[PDB]
Write a protein that binds this ligand. Structure first.
Ligand SMILES: *[C@@H]1O[C@H](CO)[C@@H](O[C@@H]2O[C@H](CO)[C@@H](O[C@H]3O[C@H](CO)[C@@H](O)[C@H](O)[C@@H]3O)[C@H](O)[C@H]2NC(C)=O)[C@H](O)[C@H]1NC(C)=O
Ligand SMILES: *[C@@H]1O[C@H](CO)[C@@H](O[C@@H]2O[C@H](CO)[C@@H](O[C@H]3O[C@H](CO)[C@@H](O)[C@H](O)[C@@H]3O)[C@H](O)[C@H]2NC(C)=O)[C@H](O)[C@H]1NC(C)=O
Ligand SMILES: *[C@@H]1O[C@H](CO)[C@@H](O[C@@H]2O[C@H](CO)[C@@H](O[C@H]3O[C@H](CO)[C@@H](O)[C@H](O)[C@@H]3O)[C@H](O)[C@H]2NC(C)=O)[C@H](O)[C@H]1NC(C)=O
Ligand SMILES: *[C@@H]1O[C@H](CO)[C@@H](O)[C@H](O)[C@H]1NC(C)=O
Ligand SMILES: *[C@@H]1O[C@H](CO)[C@@H](O)[C@H](O)[C@H]1NC(C)=O
Ligand SMILES: *[C@@H]1O[C@H](CO)[C@@H](O)[C@H](O)[C@H]1NC(C)=O
Ligand SMILES: *[C@@H]1O[C@H](CO)[C@@H](O)[C@H](O)[C@H]1NC(C)=O
Lengths: 340, 40, 240, 46
């Protein structure tokens, strides 16, 4: 649904702690800016993508204290108030599988200098003007929106999408669903204990799967891996000489006067600036892949969660009954329920 | 008497749905709503 | 329904007359393309390390040996300025394509049809949409049925009448608190529970939450009044 | 006759088969014929 927002100060990436370099970078003009506008456009869009997907209800629905859903046991996908964030059991599984890098949440020298200066790529990034910004909606706010969508679904069916949430008994909602797939509503009520036991058993396999296999969230970890690999490639490119007497901007100024240094420094500006244009192009192209995925996730939120979908194989293999959204790091997970 | 305030954003109005194992709400009337959508 | 549609179209005119930012999605496309053409013009001012930004002020001052060193700086930076512009425009053209393919899909599915897709043509149940042109865009006026004045009812999954469980054909069972009705599942219009409103399946033991009521048979009084026709012909024929 | 609808004669449909379609009104009037006929039988006696 989103990717890490990055702000890069190209004046500090290119001309790190030099006024001599900075006065040469002004001869390229708008190049330093146009990159900040491009990365700000990407960063602003990550909050948009997250709101298009999760902010699909303007009321925060909540579940009754009595849990009589006709035998269906949602306790693994509903909130858990015992926790410091109101995520469900399956959401806390999802948050353990994806290992985020630099969520933006404050740095204070004691967590980067000394011991934590050495075994650190995020430090080498931040010291070169590369910064990762926080999302507007916290992982608690995404879990509240997800809780509202799920509490609206189980208590109110599709009706909370099309208007005010109208209550309906859960086995009466599932009867309407069964009619939606062309199975007569008496087939639910004559089998309701079986259908409930099958749903409860099928949710058990979601917990067991997410506890057992490492690679389940591969689509989301591969987004975190791509953005981290790009920030690491952008740091390693400060080591390139581009034909200068050194990669280090200060070792030129330690050795050469203003006539000879400008020939070496313009090589480093030329290669560094080409390194940022390559990064910002690749990030603008990746932001369109994430947008296309967020617009799909917003469409599955609207059509699978807020509704019931007659579209074939749009919400898993089978005839669609309903879906439950679950938050994940930079993503959404749908638990699609299907009559097969 | 104006100033810049900073605050934790509200996600929406909080609402318990009146759920019970034998209760349903049915609309006795409707609104016909016309809404604009704009696309490039 | 007509007065509500006419009143709802009145709010479209009033909204578009009143608020400045309504077409923000379309003005932001015109703003991006104008900002890009202006950035591409301002980049002619950049020296790129040459003795001047102005291509003629080099040739006003330098011979063919020295000028080629200055001019190749300006070619290098200018050509990089166009590759940056054309890359950013190729990337923006894919955002506009993706939006135009959505607008073509909303034209097909909301204007040329009626859409069962939830929230694809505004919040509510889709009735129809009207397309309107705008500068570099399309505006859809999506018309939707939104349910408005709900009342709480007691409800049941089935009725027991004759050792048999009855379910609604189309609709749901509701109680006003004393009587039971079928109604349609989108608008409260209550109807007497008849054998035409309902279908039977199985005995009354298997359904969780089923309740007792009496299911009217539309054929029963139509034959009971035929029994009082039969019995009065028998009564009269006692007399001769 | 409640599960089904009629259309046309039996010559036009490829692959159609013979069966007997129950009429839910028929025994509901046949039991009304045995009600009618027993009222006639009893009224022979006076
Ligand atoms: C819906 O499913 C829930 C999870 O399967 C289930 O909750 C589980 O209930 C059992 C029995 O109450 C708990 O078992 C443990 O209970 C205490 C914990 O201190 C111990 O003394 C026991 O030895 C045993 O370990 C589960 O821990 C509990 N699981 C969770 C995650 O809460 C609900 O009961 C189900 N709902 C219904 C209506 O059946
Ligand atoms: C439709 O499929 C259902 C399973 O998907 C099935 O329910 C299953 O019924 C069998 C018996 O036919 C149960 O088997 C167990 O029964 C008892 C313990 O409860 C033991 O004596 C057996 O050795 C065995 O362990 C299944 O546990 C049960 N599964 C579920 C999820 O309920 C339905 O019966 C099937 N219905 C029809 C009409 O075929
Ligand atoms: C639930 O809905 C019921 C059906 O509308 C309603 O019962 C109906 O009440 C009216 C009177 O308020 C009855 O009208 C008849 O009243 C007397 C009967 O002797 C006559 O003098 C009148 O001319 C008229 O025929 C309806 O006959 C009656 N319907 C039935 C089937 O009994 C209940 O009152 C409603 N309950 C609640 C709590 O709202
Ligand atoms: C509904 O819930 C009540 C408790 O609130 C319970 O006594 C009753 O048996 C339940 N009925 C059904 C059909 O689940
Ligand atoms: C009864 O039968 C006689 C014929 O014998 C007829 O004239 C008369 O109208 C009948 N009356 C009623 C009430 O059916
Ligand atoms: C079906 O196929 C068989 C041959 O397998 C043929 O004899 C028969 O006439 C066919 N019936 C129809 C209705 O096509
Ligand atoms: C026949 O009619 C007489 C009245 O003459 C009545 O007493 C008796 O119960 C009837 N019997 C039957 C079987 O209809």
């Amino acid at each position: 649904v989103s990717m890490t927002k990055t702000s890069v100060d190209c004046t500090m990436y290119i001309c790190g702690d030099s006024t001599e370099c900075s006065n040469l970078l002004l001869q390229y003009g708008s190049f330093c800016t146009q990159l900040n506008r491009a990365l700000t456009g990407i960063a602003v869009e990550q909050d948009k993508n997250t709101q298009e997907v999760f902010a699909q209800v303007k009321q925060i629905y909540k579940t009754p204290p009595i849990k009589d859903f006709g035998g269906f046991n949602f306790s693994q996908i509903l909130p858990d108030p015992s926790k410091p964030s109101k995520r469900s059991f399956i959401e806390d599984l999802l948050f353990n599988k994806v290992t985020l890098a630099d969520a933006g949440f404050i740095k204070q020298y004691g967590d980067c200098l000394g011991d934590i200066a050495a075994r650190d790529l995020i430090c080498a990034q931040k010291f070169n003007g590369l910064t990762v910004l926080p999302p507007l909606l916290t992982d608690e706010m995404i879990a509240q929106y997800t809780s509202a969508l799920l509490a609206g679904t189980i208590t109110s069916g599709w009706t909370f999408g099309a208007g005010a949430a109208l209550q309906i008994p859960f086995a009466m909602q599932m009867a309407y669903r069964f009619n939606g797939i062309g199975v007569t509503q008496n087939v639910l009520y004559e089998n309701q204990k079986l259908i409930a036991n099958q749903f409860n058993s099928a949710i058990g396999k979601i917990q067991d799967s997410l506890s057992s296999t490492a690679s389940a969230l591969g689509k989301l970890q591969d987004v975190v891996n791509q953005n981290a690999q790009a920030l690491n490639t952008l740091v390693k490119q400060l080591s390139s000489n581009f034909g200068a007497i050194s990669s280090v901007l200060n070792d030129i100024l330690s050795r050469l006067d203003k006539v000879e240094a400008e020939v070496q420094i313009d090589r480093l500006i030329t290669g560094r600036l080409q390194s940022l244009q390559t990064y910002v192009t690749q990030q603008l192209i990746r932001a369109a892949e994430i947008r296309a995925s967020a617009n799909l996730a917003a469409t599955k939120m609207s059509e699978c969660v807020l509704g019931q979908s007659k579209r074939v194989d749009f919400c898993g293999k089978g005839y669609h009954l309903m879906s439950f959204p679950q938050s994940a790091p930079h993503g959404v997970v749908f638990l699609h329920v299907t009559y097969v | 008497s104006q100033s810049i305030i900073a605050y934790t954003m509200s996600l929406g109005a909080e609402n318990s749905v009146a759920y019970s194992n034998n209760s349903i709400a049915i609309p006795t009337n409707f609104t016909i709503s016309v809404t604009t959508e704009i696309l490039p | 329904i007509a007065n509500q549609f006419n009143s709802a179209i009145g709010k479209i005119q009033d909204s578009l007359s009143s608020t400045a930012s309504a077409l923000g999605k379309l003005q932001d496309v015109v703003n991006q393309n104008a900002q890009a053409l202006n950035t591409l013009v301002k980049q002619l001012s950049s020296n790129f390390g040459a003795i001047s930004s102005v291509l003629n002020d080099i040739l006003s001052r330098l011979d063919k040996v020295e000028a080629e060193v200055q001019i190749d700086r300006l070619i290098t930076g200018r050509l990089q300025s166009l590759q940056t512009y054309v890359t950013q425009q190729l990337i923006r053209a894919a955002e506009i394509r993706a939006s135009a393919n959505l607008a073509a899909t909303k034209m097909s599915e909301c204007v040329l049809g009626q859409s069962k897709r939830v929230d694809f043509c505004g919040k509510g149940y889709h009735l129809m949409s009207f397309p309107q042109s705008a500068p570099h865009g399309v505006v859809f006026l999506h018309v939707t049925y939104v349910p408005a004045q709900e009342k709480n009812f007691t409800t049941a999954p089935a009725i027991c009448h004759d050792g048999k469980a009855h379910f609604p054909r189309e609709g749901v069972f509701v109680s006003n608190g004393t009587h039971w009705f079928v109604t349609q599942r989108n608008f409260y219009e209550p109807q007497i529970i008849t054998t035409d409103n309902t279908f039977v399946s199985g005995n009354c033991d298997v359904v969780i939450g089923i309740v007792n009521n009496t299911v009217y048979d539309p054929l029963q009084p139509e034959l009971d009044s035929f029994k009082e026709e039969l019995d009065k012909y028998f009564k009269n024929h006692t007399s001769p």
